[PDB]
Design a protein around this ligand. Sequence first.
Ligand SMILES: O=C(c1ccc(O)cc1)N1CCOCC1
Ligand SMILES: [Mg+2]
Length: 209
Amino acid sequence: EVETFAFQAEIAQLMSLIINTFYSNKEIFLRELISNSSDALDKIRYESLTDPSKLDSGKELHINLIPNKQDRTLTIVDTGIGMTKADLINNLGTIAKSGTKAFMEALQAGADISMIGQFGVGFYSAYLVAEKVTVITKHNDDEQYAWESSAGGSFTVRTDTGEPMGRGTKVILHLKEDQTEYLEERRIKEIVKKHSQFIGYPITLFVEK
Ligand SMILES: O=C(c1ccc(O)cc1)N1CCOCC1
Ligand SMILES: [Mg+2]
């Protein structure tokens, strides 16, 4: 049971702009994804302060970065609050329509693609490096879903029967052939140190055999 959905026109436009604009500073995608993860983790931590049972789906609050050169994927896993199916369909928890309007106006006026996170649509910077993005997520109030999109104006949602996550969000970046630098340990470490120094959760970079 796979459901296919059209992006809102303004979100298809943002994705196209991201894909088609010449812009060399692509490494900011990782900062934006880690930032989203940090915000998701903040959310569950806040809930947990008045209801400890909120962490029954897992107490550890962290971010893992998992490169796989065989599959040409980079995976960003967090144990944050996760997303319900509704929030996944509603632009992965963002106010993407108004965010994209503001970002576009900022760009027309001299901002650049690196400032995307100030407009609350940083998720979509994944498409600077990924030909396809898969998002697996689990929220305490819903089941585990997989969202997926190779852009082109549509995404799919299905119940995920894969490995259960407990709680949180996993973003799997199926990288463009020319973007495999972001599987290399030294490159990922450099990006993290440069851009994510003040993220208040452990970020563990996995190594490959
Ligand atoms: O799970 C996520 C999430 C995590 C990481 C991403 O890259 C995108 C969404 N979110 C739900 C809580 O509100 C923030 C978004
Ligand atoms: Mg913020």
